[PDB]
Amino acid sequence: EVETFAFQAEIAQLMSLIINTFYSNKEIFLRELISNSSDALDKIRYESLTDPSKLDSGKELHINLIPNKQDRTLTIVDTGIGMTKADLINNLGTIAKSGTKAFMEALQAGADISMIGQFGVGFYSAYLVAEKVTVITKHNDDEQYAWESSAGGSFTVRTDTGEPMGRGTKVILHLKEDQTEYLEERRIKEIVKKHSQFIGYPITLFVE
């Protein structure tokens, strides 16, 4: 069972801006997704402070970066709080309508696309480098779901009968053909060191 949804107009506009604007500094997508993962990790840590059973679905709080040159994917995995079905549908747990408005106003006043994360919509920077994004997620007390979109105004949601995750989120970037530098170990290492060097969770770059 696959459900197809339309993006809200403002989010479709955000995505079209990201996909169509000439902007060479694409590498910031990784900083933004790592930051989102850190935020998700913070959320489950906070819940666990008063209810340790929240970590029964996995105690380790970390981020994995997994390139796969055969599939042309870069996957960012975290063991954060995850998302419910309703969160997925609600713009991946964001306030993307108001955030998009604030980002657009900032762009008009001299900001650039690299500032996207200040507006709570950094996830969508994935579309700087990905033709399709698949998000697999598992929140405590909800089932595992897969969200997917190739932009074009719609996304899908289905229950994921794939490999179980204990808890967290996997963002699978199906890279554009000219963006395969982001599968190279030395390039990923460089970007992590430049933009994510103080993130307070382990970031493991897998090799192939």
Residue ranges per domain, the chain? Answer: 1-208
Q: How far apart are CA 52 and CA 133, in angstroms?
A: 32
- Going by their DSSP bridges, the two strands 63-68 and 154-159 should be labelled as unpaired
Distances (CA, A) of 9 to 16, 18, 48, 78, 110: 11, 14, 37, 29, 23
Q: How far apart are CA 57 and CA 115, in angstroms?
A: 34
- Going by their DSSP bridges, the two strands 168-175 and 130-138 should be labelled as antiparallel
Q: Binding site annotation covers 97? A: yes
Q: Binding site annotation covers 193? A: no
The angstrom resolution of this structure is 1.2
Q: Which residue has the tokens 């059973």?
A: 53
Tokens of 75: 């996957």
SS3 159: strand
Tokens of 74: 């870069």
Among residues 74, 34, 58, 79, the alpha carbon closest in space to that of 199 is found at 34
Contact yes or no for 123/32 (Cβ under 8 A): yes
Cα torsion 51, 54, 59, 64: sign: negative
Structurally, at CATH architecture level, domain 1-208 sits in 2-Layer Sandwich (3.30)
Contacts for 100-105 with beta carbons within 8 Å, 24 or more apart? 100/10, 100/11, 100/13, 100/14, 101/10, 103/14
Q: Binding site annotation covers 90? A: no
Q: Which amino acid is at 34?
A: I
CB atoms within 10 A of CB 91: 22
Tokens of 151: 């932009």
> What does the angle CA 133 – CA 134 – CA 138 come to, to the nearest 5 degrees?
140
